[PDB]
Design a protein around this ligand. Structure first.
Ligand SMILES: *CCC1=C(C)C(=O)N/C1=C\c1[nH]c(/C=C2\N=C(C[C@H]3NC(=O)C([C@H](*)C)=C3C)C(C)=C2CCC(=O)O)c(CCC(=O)O)c1C
Ligand SMILES: *CCC1=C(C)C(=O)N/C1=C\c1[nH]c(/C=C2\N=C(C[C@H]3NC(=O)C([C@H](*)C)=C3C)C(C)=C2CCC(=O)O)c(CCC(=O)O)c1C
Ligand SMILES: *[C@@H](C)C1=C(C)C(=O)N/C1=C\c1[nH]c(/C=C2N=C(/C=C3\NC(=O)C(CC)=C3C)C(C)=C\2CCC(=O)O)c(CCC(=O)O)c1C
Ligand SMILES: *[C@@H](C)C1=C(C)C(=O)N/C1=C\c1[nH]c(/C=C2N=C(/C=C3\NC(=O)C(CC)=C3C)C(C)=C\2CCC(=O)O)c(CCC(=O)O)c1C
Ligand SMILES: *[C@@H](C)[C@H]1/C(=C/c2[nH]c(/C=C3N=C(/C=C4\NC(=O)C(CC)=C4C)C(C)=C\3CCC(=O)O)c(CCC(=O)O)c2C)NC(=O)[C@@H]1C
Ligand SMILES: *[C@@H](C)[C@H]1/C(=C/c2[nH]c(/C=C3N=C(/C=C4\NC(=O)C(CC)=C4C)C(C)=C\3CCC(=O)O)c(CCC(=O)O)c2C)NC(=O)[C@@H]1C
Ligand SMILES: *[C@H](C)[C@H]1/C(=C/c2[nH]c(/C=C3N=C(/C=C4\NC(=O)C(CC)=C4C)C(C)=C\3CCC(=O)O)c(CCC(=O)O)c2C)NC(=O)[C@@H]1C
Ligand SMILES: *[C@H](C)[C@H]1/C(=C/c2[nH]c(/C=C3N=C(/C=C4\NC(=O)C(CC)=C4C)C(C)=C\3CCC(=O)O)c(CCC(=O)O)c2C)NC(=O)[C@@H]1C
Lengths: 168, 81, 70, 162
């Protein structure tokens, strides 16, 4: 997938081969599916939770005041979520660190984007994604075969931790 | 009859007990009670969905399998109607 | 380093087993001889954008749920 | 805009049944409106993927937008029915003439029936705080009457579109 980052369709024998190049290929693809197919909710739930716990962020003094600022924040949360989703697909954080995190703290410092709010938004997204992967719903209320995805959940948790460490 | 202007009531619920910000949108008689810190906002506005949003939602829907946590499953692979 | 073009990878997962009405013409590699012939991952790199409609609606939710203190 | 606060809000609460609980129930809908619409249109589609096939009614950004829009319009008029305690505005300004509009356009009835059904189930779960997410804090109690009332409003939508 390195080409597209720097449309790809991987199916058939290419997909068969791709699954033997990562650990737990099938469950990994299920986890990605859960995250990307719920992206708008994941993102808005994190940004609105950041705000509902610290309403000054949408006061006239707050960094999310105005539709244009709110849109930029929602966008960034989605950028982060997508690079985490790519790390889960690829099994490593190289592109996340290079293309999403390197230089971001300095950018936010120069813009005045607040660290506290960023950490809370990321933390809500982390908890949400971990819960989608460690989903213990009864089978009739679950889109995937029920089983243990705890290793994948820990892996995705670690990718969010790399985001938090870069922004703090 | 529907007006065909796609306008609907937008309701916002402000339960702002414990909020120190003073707002003056409501101009009526005071409650001298908790309702001085509570408000319902109602507007009638065109409901709008941008084609950017519609494209993004299509991409979220087009896998046809994933759902919210702990909800019923009705997905299929054939035309139903 | 971030490019400051706001572009991110968009992943789409197609578990299309049993689906017949879509022409599986996008993947042009060899067949697996297995269920992967009905399965496909798509990846594109896109500018991430948020419409004013979503920005306004998310704000509208927020304003409806600022946490009370008591 | 209309702002109902202070003594006007006390009057509103007295002029409907279970005023404070009713506002919690309304808030369970409007504070989740984008997720409710998403679940309904997405489930409509995953049940019948033909809706986004190259000839289906939700194909193209313009039509998808209109459908997402309509689900929200319907949802918001239901939320107003719950705020006010009756369906007169919903029937007059949202349902009257809508079935023939949809028939003229070819907007599929079974799709609307599925979307409305999901919206009803989702709202009832948020109102009763049995959804996975429970972000709105309420004092403990029984909201089954308000849940049944909103279920009635969605059923009038279904009845008008069926
Ligand atoms: C929206 C996507 C989603 C679907 C679909 C689903 O089924 N569950 C989903 C989301 C989800 N959210 C969490 C956790 C949190 N969400 C928030 C924000 C909301 N809480 C508020 O107080 C608030 C303003 C009024 C919100 C908006 C928060 C704060 C959390 C908790 C984060 C934490 O630190 O633990 C989850 C995780 C599972 C859970 O129930 O906590 C999920 C799956
Ligand atoms: C809005 C997201 C959300 C959060 C956050 C949360 O905590 N609950 C949420 C959603 C929610 N959904 C339902 C019920 C249904 N959703 C669907 C659609 C999905 N199922 C699919 O198969 C599919 C395509 C792959 C979907 C998308 C359906 C069919 C239902 C059931 C509808 C019915 O008529 O019963 C609920 C209600 C859950 C409950 O009743 O306990 C909630 C809260
Ligand atoms: C406390 C929750 C809070 C802190 C802390 C903070 O920094 N900002 C806070 C609240 C806040 N409120 C609003 C907007 C509105 N609040 C409203 C409530 C009332 N209006 C009234 O007249 C009364 C008395 C009966 C209320 C209880 C309303 C109606 C708001 C919307 C006004 C509008 O239509 O534009 C915000 C948003 C930003 C702002 O206007 O200050 C915030 C952040
Ligand atoms: C079955 C679920 C179905 C019915 C019934 C129906 O009416 N439409 C259905 C499916 C459907 N699929 C798509 C889009 C894509 N499907 C893809 C899957 C594969 N492509 C391949 O080459 C292979 C072989 C390995 C696949 C398993 C892909 C990649 C799709 C995206 C195409 C793109 O990006 O342009 C849709 C959307 C509309 C369409 O193109 O048919 C639908 C409705
Ligand atoms: C944690 C991630 C969740 C969970 C997952 C889980 N999935 C499986 C089994 C399968 N999942 C797939 C999915 C795909 N393979 C593909 O090629 C594609 C399209 C790109 C997808 C979506 C497949 C094919 C399987 C094999 C079974 C089948 O054919 O249906 C399991 C079972 C164990 C295993 O590894 O096979 C599990 C546990 N389950 C959960 O409960 C978590 C919420
Ligand atoms: C079902 C909906 C859930 C449930 C509700 C429930 N709420 C209360 C008490 C209150 N609810 C409110 C809410 C508001 N009042 C406002 O003015 C506004 C802003 C417009 C809101 C959001 C309030 C203030 C109260 C307290 C009232 C008081 O004077 O103390 C109850 C308690 C019973 C009652 O009738 O008051 C209940 C049961 N509870 C649940 O468990 C369901 C999930
Ligand atoms: C989505 C769940 C379903 C669906 C929706 C769909 N609707 C339209 C077009 C229109 N919808 C309306 C509805 C209203 N107008 C109003 O003023 C009100 C009350 C406030 C309502 C409820 C109207 C008037 C139109 C036509 C005009 C317009 O959109 O501006 C479309 C587009 C139809 C087309 O062919 O272009 C769609 C797709 N479609 C589905 O498949 C779902 C079942
Ligand atoms: C939301 C949780 C938080 C918040 C966000 C916020 N961000 C900006 C502005 C920018 N964000 C970026 C980020 C990136 N660009 C990239 O290319 C990538 C990697 C692919 C990332 C992560 C950049 C470059 C900017 C500035 C330039 C631009 O927007 O194109 C804003 C707007 C800041 C302003 O002053 O206008 C906001 C509001 N704000 C918050 O309060 C939350 C904590």
């Amino acid at each position: 997938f390195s080409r597209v980052v720097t449309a790809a369709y991987v199916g058939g024998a290419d997909l068969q081969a791709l699954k033997k190049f990562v650990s737990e290929g099938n469950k990994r693809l299920d986890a990605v599916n859960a995250i990307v197919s719920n992206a708008s909710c994941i993102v808005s739930d994190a940004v609105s939770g950041m705000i509902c716990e610290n309403p000054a962020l949408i006061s006239p003094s707050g960094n999310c005041y105005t539709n244009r600022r709110m849109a930029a924040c929602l966008r960034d949360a989605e950028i982060i979520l997508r690079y985490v989703s790519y790390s889960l697909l690829s099994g490593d954080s190289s592109v996340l660190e290079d293309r999403c995190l390197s230089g971001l703290k300095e950018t936010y410092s120069s813009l005045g984007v607040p660290t506290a709010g960023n950490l809370r938004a990321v933390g809500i997204m982390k908890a949400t994604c971990v819960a989608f992967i460690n989903n213990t719903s009864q089978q009739k209320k679950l889109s995937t075969p029920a089983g243990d995805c705890s290793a994948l959940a820990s892996e995705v948790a670690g990718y969010f931790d790399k985001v938090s460490a870069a922004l703090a | 009859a529907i007006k065909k202007d796609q306008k609907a009531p937008i309701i916002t619920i402000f339960d702002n007990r414990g909020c120190e910000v003073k707002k003056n949108n409501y101009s009526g008689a005071k409650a001298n009670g908790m309702e001085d810190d509570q408000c319902v906002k109602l507007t009638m506005e065109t409901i709008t969905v941008s084609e950017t949003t519609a494209a993004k939602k299509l991409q979220e829907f087009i896998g046809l399998k994933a759902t919210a946590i702990n909800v019923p499953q009705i997905s299929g692979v054939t035309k139903k109607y | 380093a971030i490019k400051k073009d706001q572009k991110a990878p968009v992943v789409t997962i197609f578990d299309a087993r049993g689906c017949k009405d879509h022409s599986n013409k996008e993947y042009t590699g060899a067949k697996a001889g297995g269920m992967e012939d009905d399965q496909c991952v798509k990846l594109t790199m896109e500018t991430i954008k948020v419409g004013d409609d979503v920005a306004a609606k998310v704000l509208g939710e927020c304003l409806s749920e600022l946490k009370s203190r008591k």
